[PDB]
DNA sequence: CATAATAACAATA
DNA sequence: TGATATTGTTATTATG
DNA sequence: CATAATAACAATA
DNA sequence: TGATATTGTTATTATG
């Protein structure tokens, strides 16, 4: 089903890491590599269970969230090396209790958000800053700008986004564009995978599109194009983190620090406040503009983070 | 654990039904009664499985939602008759697939709601009608009135609600009261079971409280007091249905028919529109006023049903 | 003498 | 109703 | 001659 | 991460 095979992505990573001139050892990837190796020729389920047990034991002392992520790394390797039918996929898994608990923690944090939204007092400043970034010659700057003005995920904006003009009857839409290249999504109906769909933008569409074409045409943009999430991460993440931190440090709400995804959160609040037609709920509207699954109203809870000072003002205008 | 016992509630119902002068036969309750009987002395799991299988087979041809409800009836009987440790409780259950599907259907309908809210054009009329009902001498009328002005569930208002004045510093709150007697809730932390808590009212608290005391003091109110859900249902439900239908038929939004629970839905929309402080989301606010569990933001999706014509007007006031 | 580079470690949607 | 893909933070490594 | 009463049947939160 | 409690609709029954 079969009993042999290799998780090639892991191995290439190990081989490249063999001659770095700095950095941590790839101990986790090495464990995975050896685990897949030891599986080769293995046919008894008890053997498989013993091997996984050894693994799980190593992992103890890590955070729950870490452990869960690692189980994903292993399972993705087993699938890579042996396929979808390997009996180890029923064995190498966390128990139901760990996932249940994970979900309890997630949901509690969110409910705390919903109870105490952050007033984003200088949101106009932040949006203008992003707009200013759209005219920068530095493609990282353009990219930040796009995350704020379009609300796409960094990985989307930088590596795989397709933007196009959205028609408005006989003309082109001024406040919205077409987007393709939704991440965190596999093929399935009611999924936006490889689906093109209209989204609002927080500045003139012409600007956004122009700026994106500059991004895609720069040398760095051609390098970024089509990267894996791993490569995108290691190539760009810490720099994007420090850049975004430096850009908004004295305008960002004092409750939190400025993080790239904040632009996506803020985007949704702002677009809802400006564009939501009246027969739609906040949940449904977010989930629409954010490319969430059909009948997925729950992922939208994650994004209710800020309250605009105008809303805060006039809700205070009672008696 | 043990092998003998009786589901007394079922049996009393059968015995009383023995001499009605009208009405359907209690065939379902009789099946349950016989099933519990046949369980007496039964010790082998295969025997138990055979008995449940026979049952499930009878039930086929009913709606999924019906079937699920019936499985609740049976399981509640087993628990009543033999306790929580009886091995039949692991056998008499729907499969995971049925519950999963149930949830898929529920969630799809809700997402359709969220996409197409109903504009409750005459909501002011409806609320005044409820207010007018608060001064009626007929306790069913007072009760309807209370469901609209307080958003409590019919079963709550009629049989077990405790209302009290809510203090406001040194005085009594004018727009809110204290409520105890939350239904659909078992003891557990982060549950409002036997918990008293402040809720908004859509007319002067003094009125609401006065009217409720009249309700509780009428002969019919003393009869309603402390009823089981079954008795409340059979005593009052069809009348409350027809009364509510006749009361609002020409003011209720034409998309649906006037149903008692609509007052609870409308209540939440209206109270949010008038009272929600600005650092709270719609989800968290509903779940608060509706007595939902802590960190329960999902039950609140069910209530997003209507859009107020004022909201609809000024969201239309874009460009 | 100390710090950039890298992956482990971790949280979020 | 089963067990993921992205974003965010920090410890450890090699290096004139 | 037909209809109120009752529980089955069903959906919702 | 297991398998409920309420609200809403209709078929069937007994009955001068
Ligand atoms: C347990 C599990 C969680 N998730 C993610 C999506 C949910 O928003 C989140 C809840 O914790 O976990 C999956 O994508 N697949 C899974 O199997
Ligand atoms: C499956 C299940 C559903 N429910 C209810 C509550 C949820 O809102 C609803 C989802 O379908 O079902 C329970 O209370 N317990 C259960 O075990």
Author numbering:
A (entry chain A), B (entry chain A): 103 to 421
Q: What does the publication say?
A:
Hairpin telomeres of bacterial linear chromosomes are generated by a DNA cutting–rejoining enzyme protelomerase. Protelomerase resolves a concatenated dimer of chromosomes as the last step of chromosome replication, converting a palindromic DNA sequence at the junctions between chromosomes into covalently closed hairpins. The protelomerase enzymes function as a dimer, making staggered cleavages of both strands of DNA to form covalent 3′-phosphotyrosine linkages, then exchanging the released 5′-ends while holding onto the 3′-ends, and finally sealing the broken DNA strands to generate two hairpin ends. The TelA monomer consists of two structural domains, the catalytic domain and an α-helical bundle domain, that together clamp down the DNA substrate.
